[PDB]
Amino acid sequence: ETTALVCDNGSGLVKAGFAGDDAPRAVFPSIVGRPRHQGVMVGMGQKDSYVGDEAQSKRGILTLKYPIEHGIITNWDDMEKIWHHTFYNELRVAPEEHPTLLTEAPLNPKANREKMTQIMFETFNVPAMYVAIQAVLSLYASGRTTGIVLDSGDGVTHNVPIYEGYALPHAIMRLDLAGRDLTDYLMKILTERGYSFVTTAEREIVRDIKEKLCYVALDFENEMATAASSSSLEKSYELPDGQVITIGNERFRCPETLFQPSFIGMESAGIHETTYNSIMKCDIDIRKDLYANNVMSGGTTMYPGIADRMQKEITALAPSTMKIKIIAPPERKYSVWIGGSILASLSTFQQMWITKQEYDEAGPSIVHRKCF
């Protein structure tokens, strides 16, 4: 095929474009927004739903919903709006002409992948499609055939060990804590300095505070003490409406939830201990090359100082007789998409698409025998 789509149908943000390009043609919020107020002006574009950057622009009059929660599509009537928008509004393709790579977290419900397959063949009529694991696509962007990938988006953090191009599915870890839970935790702790952000539209203002100002502190208890001898670690943000909020230790106490999940009251290992536990579930001879090829992917891996702390923490867990290396590239915000754009372009991948002809003789249950 000349061109195929790769759609990274992520939680919170969707990345889309053509296989063989080096970056997404489109990136926009994975949001559908609906009016919450009385419409009074006739003779106007009174539209019953907005999606992506349209919903983000009009958000003061909208309730904003994400159809994807924790990497699982929880609203299919609105996920069809996000895929319709993706194909017809800023890729501006005919889906009937282009096969599509699609993207999923490990350990998802099987019904998610089946219903994602059924919609692509029966609503969008694609020639062929395939659903790929986000952490396998991250090694394609990095150019590896071995590494443990820590992929962390808006809804899920997951670890996938790979060695010599074989995955270890018994050692895959999933953690329902990534960018949305950090945004919600920042809304919670910003209340303690006096700022109430409570609506779905204000949740997007706090996501921008988090992205602009938050960081991961190399030693948290020393940083907490450094912020008690105050004013040096503080920054300020200017809200829509032009009011300013000053922000202090909540600037690094927020991303620490990744390393201390008990801040959001959940009982789990932190992301450093989840990467270590996943390496220690692997066969002993591969562990040396996994510690040396520790790949980071996805937007929740974009905090300043997170790779320095991930190296510090895996180095304290692992035996000191060997070298941990953290491979967090500057474009890792898109490595799942870039690696899907590599996979969908390979000549040896063109045999692996599920085709329309192969779906309509096997039903949506085809997707489990033909995809990892």
Ligand X SMILES: Nc1ncnc2c1ncn2[C@@H]1O[C@H](COP(=O)(O)OP(=O)(O)O)[C@@H](O)[C@H]1O
**What residues from 306 to 345 belong to the interface with ligand X (CB under 6 A)?**
333
**What residues from 197 to 216 belong to the interface with ligand X (CB under 6 A)?**
207, 210-211
Closest to Mg ion by CB, 10 or 29: 10
> Which residue in the set 20, 165, 304, 363 belongs to the binding site for its own copies (CB under 8 A)?
165
**What residues from 216 to 245 belong to the interface with ligand X (CB under 6 A)?**
none
Residue 45: CB partners within 8 Å, gap ≥ 6? Answer: none
Question: Closest Cα to residue 14, out of 29, 33, 36, 34?
Answer: 29
**Binding window for ligand X (CB under 6 A); candidates: 152-160, 285-293, 317-325, 360-368:** 152-160
Beta bridge partners of residue 27, listed in sequence order:
15
- Judged by CB under 6 A, does residue 7 bind ligand X? no
Query: What's the token pair of residue 304?
Result: 């300043």
> Which residue in the set 102, 150, 271, 286 belongs to the binding site for its own copies (CB under 8 A)?
286
**Binding window for its own copies (CB under 8 A); candidates: 84-92, 137-145, 294-302, 326-334:** 137-145
Binding mask 14-43 for its own copies (x = CB under 8 A): ---------------------xxxxxxxxx
- 213 in Cβ contact with 250 (< 8 Å): no
Helical segments of the chain, H only? 53-57, 76-85, 110-122, 134-142, 179-190, 200-213, 220-228, 250-253, 271-280, 287-291, 306-317, 335-343, 356-359, 366-370
Closest to its own copies by CB, 43 or 330: 43
Beta bridge partners of residue 355, listed in sequence order:
128
d(CA 292, CA 142): 14
**What residues from 311 to 340 belong to the interface with its own copies (CB under 8 A)?**
318-322
CB of 357 to Mg ion, least distance (A): 31
d(CA 73, CA 108): 10
- Judged by CB under 6 A, does residue 270 bind ligand X? no
**What residues from 92 to 111 belong to the interface with its own copies (CB under 8 A)?**
107-111
- SS3 call for 83: helix
> Which residue in the set 123, 125, 145, 230 belongs to the binding site for its own copies (CB under 8 A)?
145
Closest to ligand X by CB, 11 or 275: 11
